[PDB]
Symmetry: C4
Subunit: 219 residues, 4 copies
């Protein structure tokens, strides 16, 4: 009765999409998550969802560490929880996207982790590990591999300015991004440059997507 | 020997009203609570009690998060503990009231929860879920459903001012309240408007009740 | 292998005085304590020791909450740990004293607790419960029963001034004390009034004792 | 499946050098460490590594308490973790060194601990216990036995100045050091006095070593 993630939940015989308790190896108090039990056989732990612009994603370091929003709607699970999940086994990442024309695409990454070898993942800036792309959305994440997480109030990017401030989001920014899924909910085509919910490989630098979901499952 | 609430305590063969250790799913350190083993067959976990005005209830955010008073007297268990209890199963709420003429009434709610789907219940303001009224006191809580918790130093209400400051309490204020059980212990009829221990549906807007107890049990 | 106190350690077959790991009900991480396995059959958990004046006891709230000194020498275990121990069962208190003439005396209290019913024992000031005196030192603690703990930087006493500042210690001060075992190590008779390691019932108001040990065991 | 250290990992049949989860007695959440499964039969828990100067070691108290760097490279595990490991059993210390001429030497200490009897190891300054030298590097640590840990922002040394500031490191400084393995990565011979990665007994006061590893195993 102590599943470590949504795959453990599924394999214990819980087949319905919804909110479940999980207990990562180094987070034994555990916490609630949204489980996707449908995509590619199910067992995905959601850590990010955009769908309606109801939640402010232009938040500081503490909010991105601790999480915000609601599991049933738009949310960010929190980097401390994403670290606890991704360090306990080898995980893949699934990213579901939707445009405002009801077009959908996905990106799959064979390996995904946050601060995997960091003694203090918070001080080390929750650095991204990501490799092995496949899917229909194209790759907009591999160039982010190795980058620390940057917020408007904590700059660990490779730009002379703050990428999070400039592109109004929070991400593993380099100089600055190919993806920006925590960017502003600008609702489709926008004149502003690359500061919406962007996945450059699918819809370019000036299209804020309607829906994103980022979720993990052990390989 | 790890009951999750006062019902687990009762069903393990502890029939006496009093203080017991409970261990919620996501609060495994556990904590002590007052158990009501009498009301409607027993197994109720108390989280609020007014009885004599001996404890200051006009407290800030941190006090309402962490709890205050004593389990054997006037107390608030703390929103972090009420979140830990109400997210681990489906709970009902029982509210016992007494006026200064030894009149008593109660309100029962078939569903009750605090920050049930909140990634960070503290940042999300411990929002109230409450439905399905029955009893003798009348309903003074259903209009509060969906509201965040507001204190004198943290305003998440739907008023242009701070409802907690204005009505000298701490509650899931809208604009502003039908109930105010954490209000001032003004002892019966008062000239001041709605700033005492108010349950509007029973005793109106200018009567501070002698006794309140708010308690939960799994359905 | 999870003893809750020094009595559990003793009954598991550890007969030697020394440092052991204990795991109180609501402090499951556990911590190390000094166990007295000799006094009245053994199984006493030490929480205070004076013996040489090597450790500064004139410390603030945080130090008295979290503890200081070393388990093998002069120390204060910390009110958070003393709360965790005394709330998990019914404990007695033993107080061993020594003067500078190698005279010894003790006080035994049939009941002892710190913040026993406090929702937040820290905010409630770790109030003392103590009753049922017997021994050779006389009673210098029963008048302290019901008092919150006062430090130089947090005044919860019944004096118009700060008793901890005035008598250079930290205690469940009333107005102000009959005992002051966390007072200055003034080494025997002193001109200053009641600001040393005082046990008034044995050695009066102007004698700083050489040795004190305060320790607990379940009845 | 809850090894307390790298020796428990080894004896469970994990023979490969690498990163593993360990669960110390009083740190039950556990954490990841680098295990050396080769040196003198294996089972060593690494807590310090220098190899390339890629990580800043001139850090403050909080960084030395909580840890920094990466387990696969240069890192400091953190004094809170080193306290949790060394208080749960009797440990020996192994120190591996390398100069820039591919010369190697080691120091072995039959006993090693950090804040072993400290009620609050952080407030007590994580004092060093170390005894019983043998090896090829010579002894540069025994004179540090009994000293608290000093950083540039927290001075507990026996110098009139701050040893950590003066020798640009963080250590159990006396007045001031025979070893300085958290000093600046100055890369071999340097004109500056004793402010590099120094092991005085092997390479003197003006030679910053290429590689250091500090690791522990139960005797
Ligand atoms: C894009 O998908 C949407 C979600 O399924 C469609 O809206 C939904 O249409 C349902 C019937 O298919 C209807 O019951 C739902 O109420 C509605 N959902 C929402 C969120 O509005 C949408 O369909 C268009 O809009 C609706 C309201 C109807 O007028 C349809 O005829 C429209 O095509 C899809 N959009 C397009 C452009 O196809
Ligand atoms: C309202 O209920 C109160 C609590 O039961 C009553 O007071 C209690 O009366 C007991 C005998 O019934 C007595 O032993 C208790 O000491 C007392 N409790 C307290 C808290 O005072 C109260 O009764 C009135 O007051 C008491 C002191 C007597 O004088 C009675 O004759 C009074 O009726 C009840 N009040 C009324 C108005 O009935
Ligand atoms: C009070 O008790 C002390 C602790 O036992 C005595 O000192 C100890 O005496 C031991 C022999 O009995 C000796 O081996 C210890 O080294 C010594 N301990 C310390 C802490 O000094 C003390 O005895 C007096 O002082 C010692 C040094 C001798 O000179 C004795 O002859 C003295 O009586 C006791 N004091 C008195 C006044 O009896
Ligand atoms: C000191 O040890 C180093 C690590 O083993 C040597 O460098 C390594 O040499 C390997 C072949 O032995 C080679 O495959 C590795 O790429 C290389 N590692 C690194 C980190 O460079 C080093 O050997 C000297 O430098 C290398 C590049 C060659 O030119 C050798 O001929 C050199 O001797 C050793 N240094 C000395 C002075 O022996
Ligand atoms: C959103 C984003 O990161 N855009 C960045 C672009 C693109 O990387 C480039 O056009 C390749 O598409 O490069 C810069 O102009 C640049 O190199 O100075 C910085 C700018 O921040
Ligand atoms: C205690 C309380 O909340 N009273 C509020 C009342 C009642 O809601 C209303 O009289 C229905 O009974 O409405 C207001 O006057 C209003 O709408 O502007 C605000 C006031 O704060
Ligand atoms: C150490 C101590 O508390 N002394 C206190 C004494 C004794 O309580 C009293 O002499 C009975 O022995 O009373 C006071 O003088 C007083 O009542 O004003 C205050 C003073 O702080
Ligand atoms: C690195 C270091 O600690 N050097 C110290 C040296 C050596 O201890 C001494 O030369 C023995 O080798 O002593 C001092 O000069 C001294 O005593 O005043 C202080 C100086 O900080
Ligand atoms: Ca930057
Ligand atoms: Ca407001
Ligand atoms: Ca006072
Ligand atoms: Ca100094």
């Amino acid at each position: 009765s102590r599943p470590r993630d949504c795959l453990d939940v599924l394999l214990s015989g819980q087949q319905d999409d919804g909110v479940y308790s999980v207990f990562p190896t180094h987070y034994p108090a555990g916490f609630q998550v949204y489980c996707d039990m449908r995509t590619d056989g199910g067992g995905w732990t959601v850590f990010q969802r955009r769908e309606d612009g109801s939640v402010n994603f232009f938040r500081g370091w503490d909010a991105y560490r601790d999480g915000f929003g609601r599991l049933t709607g738009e949310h960010w699970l929190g980097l401390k929880r994403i670290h606890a999940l991704t360090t306990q086994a080898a995980y893949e990442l699934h990213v579901d996207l939707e445009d405002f024309e009801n077009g959908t695409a996905y990106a799959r990454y064979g390996s995904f982790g946050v601060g995997l070898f960091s003694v203090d993942p918070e001080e080390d800036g929750y650095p991204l590990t990501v490799a092995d792309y496949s899917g229909t959305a194209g790759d907009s994440l591999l160039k982010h591999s190795g980058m620390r997480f940057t917020t408007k109030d904590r700059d660990s990017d490779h730009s002379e300015n703050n990428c999070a401030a400039f592109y109004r989001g929070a991400w593993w920014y380099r100089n600055c991004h190919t993806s920006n899924l925590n960017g502003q909910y600008l609702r489709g085509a926008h004149a502003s440059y690359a500061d919406g919910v962007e996945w450059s490989s699918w819809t370019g630098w000036q299209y804020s997507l309607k829906f994103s979901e980022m979720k993990i499952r052990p390989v």
